[PDB]
Amino acid sequence: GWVRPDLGELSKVTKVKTDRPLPENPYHSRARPEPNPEVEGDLKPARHGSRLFFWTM
Amino acid sequence: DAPEKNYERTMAILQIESEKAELRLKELEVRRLMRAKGDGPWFQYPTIDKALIDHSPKATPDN
Ligand SMILES: CCCCCCCCCCCCCCCCCC(=O)OC[C@H](COP(=O)([O-])OC[C@H](O)COP(=O)([O-])OC[C@H](COC(=O)CCCCCCCCCCCCCCCCC)OC(=O)CCCCCCCCCCCCCCCCC)OC(=O)CCCCCCCCCCCCCCCCC
């Protein structure tokens, strides 16, 4: 009683019911480095300008 | 000019210039610490973007 599968069927992506848990860290990655802190706050002007030796702005 | 005007104007000049000098010294120290540790917004040379990584299920499993 076995029907041979049609052209297209055996290459389908199927779904599988499992009773094993999902591997939570299959790559065994350690803790990620903490990122550099972003910038936050409004942009105040430069305190007394460029401060390049004598240029007051 | 009055000696009051020259005097208090000199105090204003000295405040502005001493504040600029202390900010320049802080700028040197900030640059030294950010180059040494790399944890500031400056001296952040690029690494590889991890938005290029394909996380799709590949052709072989062991990867
Ligand atoms: C109510 C709404 C309306 C309000 C309007 C109010 C104004 C009304 C009038 C409108 C026009 C305004 C014009 C600008 C304002 C005055 C600027 C000023 O005097 O700054 C003083 C400025 C600093 O003095 P201060 O007492 O500390 O500040 C007073 C103010 O607070 C100055 O303010 P500050 O401290 O915030 O200034 C910021 C900063 C202040 O400056 C600094 O922090 C110091 C560093 C400045 C640069 C130094 C460089 C040194 C090495 C290079 C030298 C080059 C050679 C010299 C020139 C050779 C001949 C071309 O500026 C700069 O760094 C800019 C660079 C210098 C340019 C100055 C403006 C020039 C405009 C006209 C140019 C015409 C040609 C003149 C010759 C070109 C060179 C000036 O003086 C100098 O640096 C010495 C040079 C003289 C300045 C230029 C004078 C402008 C008028 C020229 C008339 C004659 C022209 C003759 C024909 C052409 C030449 C042959």
PDB file of N, CA and C in Angstrom, chain A residues 1-39:
ATOM      1  N   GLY A   1       0.772  -1.226   0.000  1.00  0.00           N
ATOM      2  CA  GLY A   1       0.000   0.000   0.000  1.00  0.00           C
ATOM      3  C   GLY A   1       0.805   1.278   0.000  1.00  0.00           C
ATOM      4  N   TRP A   2       2.083   1.216  -0.351  1.00  0.00           N
ATOM      5  CA  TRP A   2       2.947   2.386  -0.315  1.00  0.00           C
ATOM      6  C   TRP A   2       2.823   3.129  -1.637  1.00  0.00           C
ATOM      7  N   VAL A   3       2.354   4.364  -1.576  1.00  0.00           N
ATOM      8  CA  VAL A   3       2.302   5.233  -2.742  1.00  0.00           C
ATOM      9  C   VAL A   3       3.640   5.945  -2.859  1.00  0.00           C
ATOM     10  N   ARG A   4       4.239   5.887  -4.047  1.00  0.00           N
ATOM     11  CA  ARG A   4       5.472   6.621  -4.296  1.00  0.00           C
ATOM     12  C   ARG A   4       5.181   8.115  -4.268  1.00  0.00           C
ATOM     13  N   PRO A   5       5.993   8.914  -3.572  1.00  0.00           N
ATOM     14  CA  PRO A   5       5.719  10.353  -3.473  1.00  0.00           C
ATOM     15  C   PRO A   5       5.845  11.058  -4.813  1.00  0.00           C
ATOM     16  N   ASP A   6       4.987  12.054  -5.015  1.00  0.00           N
ATOM     17  CA  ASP A   6       4.991  12.819  -6.248  1.00  0.00           C
ATOM     18  C   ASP A   6       6.215  13.729  -6.315  1.00  0.00           C
ATOM     19  N   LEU A   7       6.405  14.332  -7.483  1.00  0.00           N
ATOM     20  CA  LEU A   7       7.504  15.266  -7.697  1.00  0.00           C
ATOM     21  C   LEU A   7       7.229  16.547  -6.923  1.00  0.00           C
ATOM     22  N   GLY A   8       8.041  16.816  -5.905  1.00  0.00           N
ATOM     23  CA  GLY A   8       7.881  17.979  -5.055  1.00  0.00           C
ATOM     24  C   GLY A   8       7.690  17.661  -3.592  1.00  0.00           C
ATOM     25  N   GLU A   9       7.303  16.432  -3.256  1.00  0.00           N
ATOM     26  CA  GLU A   9       6.867  16.142  -1.897  1.00  0.00           C
ATOM     27  C   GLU A   9       8.039  15.905  -0.953  1.00  0.00           C
ATOM     28  N   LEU A  10       8.995  15.055  -1.342  1.00  0.00           N
ATOM     29  CA  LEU A  10      10.102  14.689  -0.459  1.00  0.00           C
ATOM     30  C   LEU A  10      11.080  15.822  -0.197  1.00  0.00           C
ATOM     31  N   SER A  11      10.965  16.940  -0.905  1.00  0.00           N
ATOM     32  CA  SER A  11      11.784  18.112  -0.656  1.00  0.00           C
ATOM     33  C   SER A  11      11.049  19.181   0.138  1.00  0.00           C
ATOM     34  N   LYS A  12       9.882  18.865   0.692  1.00  0.00           N
ATOM     35  CA  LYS A  12       9.172  19.830   1.518  1.00  0.00           C
ATOM     36  C   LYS A  12       9.837  19.956   2.880  1.00  0.00           C
ATOM     37  N   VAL A  13       9.683  21.127   3.482  1.00  0.00           N
ATOM     38  CA  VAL A  13      10.090  21.349   4.861  1.00  0.00           C
ATOM     39  C   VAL A  13       8.926  20.965   5.760  1.00  0.00           C
ATOM     40  N   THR A  14       9.125  19.942   6.576  1.00  0.00           N
ATOM     41  CA  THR A  14       8.072  19.422   7.426  1.00  0.00           C
ATOM     42  C   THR A  14       8.245  19.934   8.853  1.00  0.00           C
ATOM     43  N   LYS A  15       7.285  19.609   9.713  1.00  0.00           N
ATOM     44  CA  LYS A  15       7.387  19.917  11.130  1.00  0.00           C
ATOM     45  C   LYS A  15       7.464  18.628  11.937  1.00  0.00           C
ATOM     46  N   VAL A  16       8.205  18.690  13.039  1.00  0.00           N
ATOM     47  CA  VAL A  16       8.534  17.526  13.850  1.00  0.00           C
ATOM     48  C   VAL A  16       8.146  17.812  15.290  1.00  0.00           C
ATOM     49  N   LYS A  17       7.357  16.924  15.884  1.00  0.00           N
ATOM     50  CA  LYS A  17       7.048  17.019  17.302  1.00  0.00           C
ATOM     51  C   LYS A  17       8.112  16.271  18.094  1.00  0.00           C
ATOM     52  N   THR A  18       8.789  16.981  18.990  1.00  0.00           N
ATOM     53  CA  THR A  18       9.851  16.421  19.807  1.00  0.00           C
ATOM     54  C   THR A  18       9.507  16.529  21.283  1.00  0.00           C
ATOM     55  N   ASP A  19      10.125  15.647  22.064  1.00  0.00           N
ATOM     56  CA  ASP A  19       9.990  15.652  23.509  1.00  0.00           C
ATOM     57  C   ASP A  19      11.291  15.987  24.218  1.00  0.00           C
ATOM     58  N   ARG A  20      12.356  16.259  23.474  1.00  0.00           N
ATOM     59  CA  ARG A  20      13.614  16.735  24.018  1.00  0.00           C
ATOM     60  C   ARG A  20      13.592  18.264  24.088  1.00  0.00           C
ATOM     61  N   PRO A  21      14.320  18.865  25.024  1.00  0.00           N
ATOM     62  CA  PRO A  21      14.337  20.326  25.107  1.00  0.00           C
ATOM     63  C   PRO A  21      15.177  20.950  24.002  1.00  0.00           C
ATOM     64  N   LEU A  22      14.846  22.192  23.697  1.00  0.00           N
ATOM     65  CA  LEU A  22      15.620  22.962  22.734  1.00  0.00           C
ATOM     66  C   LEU A  22      16.978  23.297  23.341  1.00  0.00           C
ATOM     67  N   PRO A  23      18.089  23.068  22.618  1.00  0.00           N
ATOM     68  CA  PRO A  23      19.407  23.472  23.130  1.00  0.00           C
ATOM     69  C   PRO A  23      19.534  24.978  23.280  1.00  0.00           C
ATOM     70  N   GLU A  24      19.659  25.453  24.519  1.00  0.00           N
ATOM     71  CA  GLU A  24      19.655  26.889  24.769  1.00  0.00           C
ATOM     72  C   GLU A  24      20.972  27.558  24.392  1.00  0.00           C
ATOM     73  N   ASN A  25      22.079  26.821  24.380  1.00  0.00           N
ATOM     74  CA  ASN A  25      23.367  27.347  23.928  1.00  0.00           C
ATOM     75  C   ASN A  25      24.083  26.252  23.155  1.00  0.00           C
ATOM     76  N   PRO A  26      23.705  26.032  21.891  1.00  0.00           N
ATOM     77  CA  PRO A  26      24.379  24.994  21.103  1.00  0.00           C
ATOM     78  C   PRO A  26      25.783  25.373  20.683  1.00  0.00           C
ATOM     79  N   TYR A  27      26.104  26.662  20.630  1.00  0.00           N
ATOM     80  CA  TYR A  27      27.449  27.090  20.281  1.00  0.00           C
ATOM     81  C   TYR A  27      28.372  27.173  21.481  1.00  0.00           C
ATOM     82  N   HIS A  28      27.824  27.016  22.692  1.00  0.00           N
ATOM     83  CA  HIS A  28      28.537  27.154  23.965  1.00  0.00           C
ATOM     84  C   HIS A  28      29.238  28.503  24.062  1.00  0.00           C
ATOM     85  N   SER A  29      28.542  29.539  23.610  1.00  0.00           N
ATOM     86  CA  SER A  29      29.041  30.900  23.710  1.00  0.00           C
ATOM     87  C   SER A  29      29.064  31.346  25.161  1.00  0.00           C
ATOM     88  N   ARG A  30      30.146  32.009  25.550  1.00  0.00           N
ATOM     89  CA  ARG A  30      30.248  32.554  26.895  1.00  0.00           C
ATOM     90  C   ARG A  30      29.518  33.895  26.951  1.00  0.00           C
ATOM     91  N   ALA A  31      29.710  34.636  28.039  1.00  0.00           N
ATOM     92  CA  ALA A  31      29.026  35.911  28.199  1.00  0.00           C
ATOM     93  C   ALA A  31      29.584  36.943  27.231  1.00  0.00           C
ATOM     94  N   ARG A  32      28.690  37.705  26.629  1.00  0.00           N
ATOM     95  CA  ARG A  32      29.073  38.710  25.657  1.00  0.00           C
ATOM     96  C   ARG A  32      29.671  39.926  26.355  1.00  0.00           C
ATOM     97  N   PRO A  33      30.628  40.601  25.717  1.00  0.00           N
ATOM     98  CA  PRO A  33      31.190  41.815  26.314  1.00  0.00           C
ATOM     99  C   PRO A  33      30.162  42.928  26.372  1.00  0.00           C
ATOM    100  N   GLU A  34      30.207  43.682  27.455  1.00  0.00           N
ATOM    101  CA  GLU A  34      29.261  44.764  27.644  1.00  0.00           C
ATOM    102  C   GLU A  34      29.576  45.891  26.671  1.00  0.00           C
ATOM    103  N   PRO A  35      28.581  46.430  25.972  1.00  0.00           N
ATOM    104  CA  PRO A  35      28.860  47.438  24.947  1.00  0.00           C
ATOM    105  C   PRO A  35      29.284  48.759  25.563  1.00  0.00           C
ATOM    106  N   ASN A  36      29.906  49.583  24.732  1.00  0.00           N
ATOM    107  CA  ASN A  36      30.293  50.908  25.174  1.00  0.00           C
ATOM    108  C   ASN A  36      29.042  51.754  25.389  1.00  0.00           C
ATOM    109  N   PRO A  37      29.018  52.594  26.424  1.00  0.00           N
ATOM    110  CA  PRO A  37      27.823  53.401  26.694  1.00  0.00           C
ATOM    111  C   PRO A  37      27.590  54.432  25.605  1.00  0.00           C
ATOM    112  N   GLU A  38      26.334  54.548  25.185  1.00  0.00           N
ATOM    113  CA  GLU A  38      25.972  55.479  24.128  1.00  0.00           C
ATOM    114  C   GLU A  38      26.017  56.913  24.643  1.00  0.00           C
ATOM    115  N   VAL A  39      25.730  57.843  23.758  1.00  0.00           N
ATOM    116  CA  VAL A  39      25.605  59.239  24.148  1.00  0.00           C
ATOM    117  C   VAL A  39      24.140  59.528  24.441  1.00  0.00           C
TER     118      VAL A  39
END
